[PDB]
Amino acid sequence: KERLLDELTLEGVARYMQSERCRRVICLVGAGISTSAGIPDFRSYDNLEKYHLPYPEAIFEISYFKKHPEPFFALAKELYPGQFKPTICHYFMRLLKDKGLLLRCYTQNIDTLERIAGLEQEDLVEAHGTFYTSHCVSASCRHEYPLSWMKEKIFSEVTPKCEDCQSLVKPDIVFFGESLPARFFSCMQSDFLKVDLLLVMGTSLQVQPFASLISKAPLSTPRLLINKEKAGQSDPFLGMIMGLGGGMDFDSKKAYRDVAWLGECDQGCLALAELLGWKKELEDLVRREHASIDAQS
Amino acid sequence: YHTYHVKRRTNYYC
Ligand SMILES: [Zn+2]
Numbered sequence A: 001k002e003r004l005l006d007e008l009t010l011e012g013v014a015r016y017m018q019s020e021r022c023r024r025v026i027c028l029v030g031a032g033i034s035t036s037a038g039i040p041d042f043r044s045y046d047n048l049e050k051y052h053l054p055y056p057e058a059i060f061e062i063s064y065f066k067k068h069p070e071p072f073f074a075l076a077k078e079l080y081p082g083q084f085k086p087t088i089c090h091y092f093m094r095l096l097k098d099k100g101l102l103l104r105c106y107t108q109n110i111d112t113l114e115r116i117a118g119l120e121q122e123d124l125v126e127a128h129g130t131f132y133t134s135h136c137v138s139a140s141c142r143h144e145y146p147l148s149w150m151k152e153k154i155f156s157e158v159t160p161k162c163e164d165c166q167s168l169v170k171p172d173i174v175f176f177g178e179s180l181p182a183r184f185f186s187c188m189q190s191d192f193l194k195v196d197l198l199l200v201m202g203t204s205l206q207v208q209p210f211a212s213l214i215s216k217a218p219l220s221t222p223r224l225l226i227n228k229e230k231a232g233q234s235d236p237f238l239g240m241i242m243g244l245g246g247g248m249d250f251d252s253k254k255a256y257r258d259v260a261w262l263g264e265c266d267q268g269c270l271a272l273a274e275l276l277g278w279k280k281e282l283e284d285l286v287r288r289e290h291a292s293i294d295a296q297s
Numbered sequence B: 001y002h003t004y005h006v007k008r009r010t011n012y013y014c
Helices: A010-017 A056-060 A062-067 A070-079 A088-098 A113-117 A147-155 A182-191 A210-215 A265-276 A279-296
Strands: A025-029 A102-107 A124-126 A129-136 A169-173 A197-201 A223-227 A258-262
Touching: A010 A197, A010 A258, A010 A265, A025 A088, A025 A210, A056 A062, A056 A070, A070 A147, A088 A102, A088 A113, A088 A265, A088 A279, A102 A182, A124 A182, A129 A147, A147 A169, A197 A265, A223 A265, A265 A279
Parallel strands: A025 A102, A025 A197, A102 A124, A197 A223, A223 A258
Antiparallel strands: A129 A169
């Protein structure tokens, strides 16, 4: 449609971010933006070997969870909010919020580091759920359990059983085979009508239907990929139908709006901030926030 | 095919 970047580079994106058109930015973030916090990317020493799974992917599958929930809860104790501090990438999105640029952040992560970084719930679409709320597995029951109730069991190595029907209690985390929250679909419908820039950070786009989000962007909307490798160049598979289009296009002769920056997210965001002139503001924000987190202890 | 709303991997099948 229209080319808005004068150059397909990080410098070209930065220069565009300072233009008058760049009003609304949407972020798609994956596991790569939390690795530098200490949270390993399980999709890429084996962190899962200790659980003796039939296969590493099983720990995130709903059918395996309902029979063998122990490995997940052991991992959940590690992933729990408070065990980690947000990264530079997280606080970069905080800067987007405070400057009024952040329309929405869609996240594949379940570490809630976005929330801790200062992003409010309205700013957030947690595509794969949250640990803040838990429900009973029984459809006849479906009793809701608070965060503190859930937190006590997980840190005490006790599988959370229901207090009514004695069934299993799982955090509202979206496992494979489970349906995504309603917010995801209602937000994706309206958010991508008015987005000026797509920031895809720390994801190889390996999980659906999250990966399909990139096809919802308008044809002229620039899309920047900050990831350890190139991704999203294949069929987005929107609606589980092929041929609809929307795949990333960095290297072809037809490329016009897709920019790939290869490396770690922290360095990617630092580089982008340096170009934008937010370098000092970003560094201060991180150190100040981390100090405030340690102040709670 | 009918499970778009379901969390999946990037396979072009069900
Ligand atoms: Zn129950």
